[PDB]
Design a protein around this ligand. Structure first.
Ligand SMILES: [Zn+2]
Ligand SMILES: [Zn+2]
Lengths: 609, 608
């Protein structure tokens, strides 16, 4: 809890004097950093003597290797880097520090205070002992018996200066980020600094701190303000192309947003299918496993397979299995686990409760059970590990919008919108079948005004066919906020400009689009038939990268982000961060959900290169 | 200009060594602080004898009157008071302050370094006399010619800890406000403090700051990425409440965005009106100057005057005056100069070209002239200070007026949206009125799809004194992206949430809202009649602050920004930046204009 450092330049007796700041409350964990000269050797020996004569708090002394006396600016920079590394390692928490300024022979105290200013503390103080000590009773206490005479019969006054909270940018730095090499050559720690990397980090943070004109246009336009704390080299690494094989660890560790994830396309083949098939409540009404051979090369097929073949790939799950309550529970828990393993911070799961509704299970029962499964899954999860799952309701069935089904669907959506305000809740409706004319006419003939009034947003499956007019009508007559796919916006620059200026999100799915429609892979220049992601980002379009069916596509979200280097050659890692930012901004999340998601996306993993 | 300040204990060579930070050039002025203990006394005389071979700069040495040792925190507080008063007297500004950190007997060096981070210093350094080749080469070269020899042979290593900006809150303090006595027995001042007044102000400021930073910690909330590179003191100050008086200059220098600015209400009265009139091409056709008495206390009347009186306040300019081509010329030029003087980076000016049309001047002619005047204004000014102007066409009609008027307005907007693609552009339509149901019903009977397709956006004056159902209609059936005024959105939480989540901007006009409507001022605590800015910002609504009519409201956009301090108790400077960023995001700008606006908007001035 409490940590006391009080680095020793000389005069070992300062440290035992400094551990009586709190009194009969203790200093919990105690560490010491010192210059490893011959003079200190008696001092460190006597510090060990005092430590062994008074048990209690953890005791560690760290002498610096190849540093015998601070003698210049460079000998001070070396100790300053070692001080910062030992500080971050021995006191990991940003505000658990009781920094002691006493005991500096040459600028040690100044550097210690400056480190307190730069990294933070909760008490930067100085210790004074009365001069009623020594052989003649005229100096301070510099002996074990003198130290005890000081501790008892109170003679210690403590000048507290302040907590000094420290720089916000430098508080993100930790010991694992900057390893410090230590050798236990005895009971005393022996520390050396390998590279001057903390020093460069801190100085770079402090340069743009005082830079006025040079700082601007060098860190601006950056999608996340936390990236302005990033080193200039880590920012250059962001403006360079994504590596699909080297940046896999980075993308996997990236907090991500999922806005397009159908529930019924998750456990459609393999072990997940047989798990959702074994958690069944009724194991004898369960449909047989239909032989569905995956296309050769899956998830990357040699030729596009089309939409109907893609849909029939997910025929072992969906309405087949999820009408069983046990299968639906297994499906929801396993999909939440798959979202957890992929570092998905926020997710909007598209579900169609009527497709999973049985004779004894009305659509509202199915929807309520799905919501409760996801709510339990999130409630069993720590808040900085949690994925906030929201729910969307889908309007399926190409070729015919029978007015009875949309009315049941939208009414269910409206009832569920007002039933839950916290945790998992229904936040919108997804309008599938938009790629027809009868279902599309039924959608535009349906009144979505109650949906708009209750706070539900609208998404549409877009751009599978080059239908600009359908996009126009969904945007302005349906008040849709997001477009699914929409792979042919670039053909009409006017619709591009409208979508970009109105902030309408485009939900791109790399593997799904590649498998259903087909796109170039590993091309050298852009061309005409290339995936439209780069051209949408250049237009100013809020592009979001999602899956569609985790099972049918046989892919996670991180793999989908990895493919963008193969689908769009030259895509940078900053563009991936921008895509995550667009997905966060476009999510149908309320205030608390949005703040939580933006708090999770500020924790972008640092590049390990 | 530069100043040097050392403290002195037994070691007196610290000051002569520290004066060698600049070689033979030295420092323009130097002062020294010192205690009163008999131990240090010979050092004072030796320091005094050290000069008299360096004519020019004057060297002063101060000694606190009755301090003999710093043996308690009590003495360290009185010494810190004296030290800060002496620092503020002898080192007025922080850009020329060099704070020598050696000669630091007990907690004096820590105090000197702690006084460098609160009040500021251009360099905070520490002097080392290494190597210690004194007599027989065993101790640091101090006392007597042992110091001048060291000056002649280096061995003075200078540990420069860097500079220190200083707390913005603690840099307005001056020496006259906290005087220090100067009892002078010859060359040496025995300075002491009258009362512990300065320390109390410092500790209070630091205490409210530590209460603030706890709930205002991080760099992931800042709307501008360039803000994340600010010093922690400057970031902490950015979260402090905005002061309408001491932040006048900072808000004035801010790059701002204007989204609601009527062209016809700019030179409404005063010298601007006469300057516009004297540029008329036909002085004999100028209407007489009407006697329009402004309400007492203008621009801050004690009671609201209402929308009708506010409109009548601008009868001496606008439709009557701007039918003259020279008058419209001068109107556009002076409005652009007003935008430039206010450091406005992006502006959307609302105009009614048909209101300024004549027999020989069609509305298209008037719109073309307005656009070309603004374009030429943008071309004459350098790009760094260049304000980008876009045009909105105002769809206002008459009680029992014409749908043909609205049709002509929308056709003109569509035609202009295609005529110009660079510089000044007609980027949307402003559906004025929208309060009465006679004109509001005509809006919904009009097809706005041609407006939507050509790329024009829609903004409505809705929410001033009308229903929330009109807000729903504008949002969903008119595809409006911005709402004019809309001060009653918080009454209906569902409509407020829809506005917040859909990203619809709310165009607040603080001065115009205070003048037309009524709102408490400087109430220091929120209530039921308070300005809805705080609740709108908290709910997640994109809130832009605008001027409406510059001439009628008699206030610039800086003044509108600063009036939110008196309308909203506790508005922060970071919230002003958030309003600017909301305006930038809500602008009907294309890629080039948005990029330029963000390039200029990242250039946030630093506090003084
Ligand atoms: Zn889909
Ligand atoms: Zn207006």
């Amino acid at each position: 809890m409490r940590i006391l450092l009080c680095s020793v330049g000389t005069s070992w007796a300062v440290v035992p004097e400094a551990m009586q700041l709190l009194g009969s409350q203790g200093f919990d964990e105690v560490h010491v950093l010192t210059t490893a000269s011959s003079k200190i050797s008696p001092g460190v020996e006597q510090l060990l003597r005092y430590f062994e004569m008074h048990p209690g708090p953890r005791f560690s002394i760290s002498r610096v290797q190849d540093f015998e006396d601070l003698r210049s600016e460079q000998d001070h920079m070396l100790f300053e880097e070692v001080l910062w590394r030992w500080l971050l390692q021995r006191a990991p928490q940003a505000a658990h520090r009781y920094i002691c300024l006493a005991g500096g022979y040459k600028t040690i105290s100044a550097a210690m205070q400056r480190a307190a200013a730069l990294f933070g503390a909760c008490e930067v103080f100085h210790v004074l002992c009365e001069p009623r000590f020594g052989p003649q009773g005229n100096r301070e206490a510099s002996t074990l018996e003198e130290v005890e005479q000081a501790i008892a019969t109170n003679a210690l006054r403590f000048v507290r200066l302040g907590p000094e909270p420290g720089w916000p940018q430098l508080r993100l730095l930790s010991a694992p980020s900057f390893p410090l090499e230590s050798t236990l050559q005895g009971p005393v720690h022996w520390v050396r600094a390998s590279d001057m990397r903390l020093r460069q980090h801190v100085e770079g943070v402090l340069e743009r701190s005082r830079h006025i004109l040079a700082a601007w246009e060098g860190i601006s336009e950056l999608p996340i303000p936390a990236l302005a704390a990033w080193p200039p080299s880590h920012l250059r690494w962001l403006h360079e192309p994504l590596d699909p094989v080297q940046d896999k660890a980075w993308v996997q560790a990236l907090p991500k947003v999922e806005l397009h994830c159908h529930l019924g396309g998750f456990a459609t083949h393999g072990e997940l299918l047989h798990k959702v098939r074994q958690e069944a409540a009724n194991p004898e009404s369960l449909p047989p496993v239909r032989a569905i051979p995956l296309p050769p090369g899956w998830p990357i097929p040699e030729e596009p397979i089309g939409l109907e073949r893609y849909m029939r790939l997910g025929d072992n799950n969906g309405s087949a299995l999820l009408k069983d309550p046990g299968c639906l529970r297994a499906q929801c828990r396993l999909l939440y686990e798959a979202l957890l393993a992929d570092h998905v911070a926020y997710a909007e799961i598209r579900c169609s409760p009527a497709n999973y509704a049985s004779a004894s299970r009305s659509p509202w029962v199915v929807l309520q059970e799905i919501r409760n499964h996801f709510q339990q899954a999130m409630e069993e999860t720590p808040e900085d590990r949690r994925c906030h799952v929201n729910l969307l309701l889908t309007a399926t069935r190409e070729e015919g919008g029978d007015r009875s089904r949309i009315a049941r669907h939208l009414a269910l959506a409206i009832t569920a919108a007002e039933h839950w305000k916290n945790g998992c809740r229904v936040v919108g409706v997804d309008l599938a079948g938009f790629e027809d004319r009868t279902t599309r006419a039924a959608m535009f003939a349906t009144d979505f005004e109650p949906v708009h009034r209750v706070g539900l947003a609208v998404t549409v499956h877009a751009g599978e066919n080059d239908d600009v007019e359908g996009i126009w009508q969904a945007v302005f007559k349906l008040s849709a906020r997001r477009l699914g796919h929409a792979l042919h916006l670039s053909r009409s620059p006017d619709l591009l400009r409208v979508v970009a200026e109105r902030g309408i999100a485009v939900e791109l799915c790399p593997y799904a689009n590649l498998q259903i429609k087909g796109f170039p892979l590993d091309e050298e220049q852009e061309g005409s038939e290339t995936y439209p992601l780069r051209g949408y980002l250049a237009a100013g379009v809020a592009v979001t990268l999602n899956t569609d069916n985790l099972g049918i596509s046989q892919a996670s979200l991180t793999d989908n982000l990895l493919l963008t280097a193969r689908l769009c050659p030259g895509i940078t890692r900053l563009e991936v961060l921008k895509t995550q930012v667009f997905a966060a901004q476009a999510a149908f999340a309320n205030q608390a959900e949005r703040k939580a998601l933006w708090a999770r996306l500020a924790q972008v993993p640092v590049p390990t290169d």
